[PDB]
């Protein structure tokens, strides 16, 4: 009856050519589980183990939006939530820098701006938690982002990433890591 749970341990944003498992929480009573992927595809009965999907290289491919359902009571469960599985690394990785500075006074509020020697058809940033930038269907080669207002008892980590349109779910290479400075 109870709609389930669909997670992904470590993460949803998984390094390349790397692995991850996806995790469908139903009832104690299910008797199957079905897992789909949107890009709907079905992920290979062989594959699912007692609802968790263990996965070994991820690709293109494995990339998009996962939901879950479970038979039990002589009911279909309803679609769990979506699932977004994301990998990182497929490009190289663009420059993320803080405009005018990465030292924020308490309560203030910084852009932080993600730029790319190659078009991207969008950008995301992630607080190490993430958000796209406008789409442009010809690409661009920089986003800017509104962070805060920053407060000093919290850290403030970010990571940017480009991506093509077409394929939102493959990102690339992480920029480095940029934290700002809130002085005390």
């Given at each position: 009856?109870?709609?389930?749970?669909?997670?992904?341990?470590?993460?949803?944003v998984?390094?390349?050519?790397?692995?991850?498992?996806?995790?469908?929480?139903?009832?104690?009573?299910?008797?199957?589980?079905?897992?789909?992927?949107?890009?709907?595809?079905?992920?290979?009965?062989?594959?699912?183990?007692?609802?968790?999907?263990h996965?070994?290289?991820?690709?293109?491919?494995?990339?998009?939006?996962?939901?879950?359902?479970?038979?039990?009571?002589?009911r279909?469960?309803?679609?769990?939530?979506?699932?977004?599985?994301?990998?990182?690394?497929?490009?190289?990785?663009?420059?993320?820098?803080?405009?005018?500075?990465?030292?924020?006074?308490?309560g203030?509020?910084?852009?932080?701006?993600?730029?790319?020697?190659?078009?991207?058809?969008?950008?995301?940033?992630?607080?190490?938690?993430?958000?796209?930038?406008?789409?442009?269907?010809?690409?661009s080669?920089?986003?800017?982002?509104?962070?805060?207002?920053?407060?000093?008892?919290?850290?403030?980590?970010?990571?940017?990433?480009?991506?093509?349109?077409?394929?939102?779910?493959?990102?690339?290479?992480?920029?480095?890591?940029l934290?700002?400075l809130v002085?005390?």
């Amino acid at each position: 009856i109870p709609k389930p749970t669909l997670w992904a341990e470590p993460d949803s944003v998984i390094t390349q050519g790397s692995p991850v498992t996806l995790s469908c929480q139903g009832s104690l009573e299910a008797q199957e589980y079905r897992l789909y992927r949107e890009k709907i595809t079905r992920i290979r009965p062989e594959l699912v183990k007692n609802g968790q999907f263990h996965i070994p290289s991820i690709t293109w491919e494995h990339t998009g939006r996962y939901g879950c359902q479970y038979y039990s009571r002589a009911r279909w469960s309803e679609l769990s939530d979506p699932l977004v599985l994301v990998m990182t690394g497929a490009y190289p990785k663009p420059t993320l820098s803080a405009q005018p500075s990465p030292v924020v006074t308490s309560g203030g509020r910084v852009t932080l701006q993600c730029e790319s020697q190659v078009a991207f058809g969008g950008f995301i940033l992630c607080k190490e938690q993430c958000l796209n930038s406008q789409p442009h269907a010809r690409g661009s080669s920089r986003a800017i982002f509104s962070v805060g207002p920053v407060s000093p008892n919290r850290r403030w980590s970010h990571r940017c990433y480009g991506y093509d349109l077409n394929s939102p779910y493959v990102w690339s290479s992480p920029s480095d890591l940029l934290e700002l400075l809130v002085p005390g």
